[PDB]
């Protein structure tokens, strides 16, 4: 069907199984002193994390104070200059002998592809943390400073009123 | 190879986010009538803590199951209103998820 | 919107679940 069937073990665990789970896990721990499914109550025991700390799904694999970059910068600049130079040479190829133009085209793309690699090491979450950091920091400083400004102006008004009433005495 | 129970339970949890899946599951009588399914739903609650929460793909179902948790004391009735209510309350629920995680 | 791009949706894809190994796992639930 369109919707896959519920998992099979879901139907094994009734309320009686839930209430008898404590004694079952106590007995299992006492006896113990891929997990084989010898009893229907085994699944409620929390599954163990794989030792390799890896998870595979759909053909793809998955697994501290914030809780020479100049070399990369100059590499990027020289790569951009070389990319412009190669673009000029490739368009010249198109001009004179376009029949073999593709011979350079993908080459240029490789440099562009390398640029993407040069982005990968530069990857930005810390920079986003920084920018959010300063925006809420400056917002709270603005709120604070307007608080002492308003309380100070109220106090100044109170002192002026006190002087006015003392003069009228 | 045969996938482990981790993979199937995680995929079930992430598929619970679909409104069509929830509507289909609640359409059948014996799914809600059987206490086994709700027992499994309450068993699934323990994935809201790390490091299990680091392995999720769509955080919305995190509330949905919790919303489904509410369904055990709110009633089936309300199945018809489920798509409308999720569409209407998507903004504030996304905001509260962001507050729970992004802050 | 009209171009169905793979592996990037807001909600879990129905085709992703169909192609996921959970489908055959449910089919091979007897073998489990």
């Amino acid at each position: 069907s369109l919707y896959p069937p519920p998992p099979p073990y879901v139907k094994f665990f009734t309320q009686s199984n839930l209430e008898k789970l404590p004694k079952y896990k106590e007995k299992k721990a006492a006896s113990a002193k891929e997990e084989e499914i010898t009893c229907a109550l085994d699944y409620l025991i929390p599954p163990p994390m794989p030792k390799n700390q890896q998870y595979r799904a759909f053909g793809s694999i998955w697994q501290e104070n914030e809780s020479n970059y100049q070399y990369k910068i100059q590499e990027l600049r020289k790569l951009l200059k070389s990319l412009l130079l190669n673009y000029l040479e490739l368009i010249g190829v198109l001009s004179i002998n376009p029949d073999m133009y593709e011979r350079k085209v993908e080459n240029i793309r490789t440099i562009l592809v390398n640029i993407h690699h040069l982005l990968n090491e530069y990857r930005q979450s810390r920079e986003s943390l920084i920018m959010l950091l300063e925006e809420q920091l400056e917002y709270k400083r603005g709120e604070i400073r307007e608080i002492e400004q308003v309380c100070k102006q109220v106090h100044d008004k109170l002192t002026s009123i006190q002087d006015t009433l003392r003069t009228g005495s | 190879p045969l996938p482990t129970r981790f993979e199937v339970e995680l995929e079930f949890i992430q598929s619970l986010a679909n409104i069509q899946y929830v509507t289909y599951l609640l359409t059948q009588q014996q799914i809600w009538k059987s206490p086994n399914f709700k027992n499994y739903l309450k068993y699934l609650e323990y994935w809201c803590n790390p490091p299990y929460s680091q392995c999720i793909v769509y955080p919305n179902c995190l509330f949905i199951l919790k919303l489904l948790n509410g369904f055990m004391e709110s009633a089936l009735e309300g199945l018809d209103e489920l798509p409308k209510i999720i569409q209407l309350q998507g903004p504030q629920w996304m905001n509260e998820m962001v507050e729970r995680w992004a802050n | 919107k009209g171009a169905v791009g793979p592996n990037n949706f807001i909600w879990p894809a129905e085709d992703a679940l169909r192609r996921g190994m959970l489908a055959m796992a449910s089919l091979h639930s007897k073998e489990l």
Partner: peptide, 25 residues
């Protein structure tokens, strides 16, 4: 003429009961 028209009694909240099954290829 027409004494009174009918009040709109639409029920979009109705979930419908369309059976879906031939999705697998």
């Amino acid at each position: 003429p027409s004494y009174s028209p009918t009040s709109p009694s639409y029920s979009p909240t109705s979930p419908s009961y369309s059976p879906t099954s031939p999705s697998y290829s």
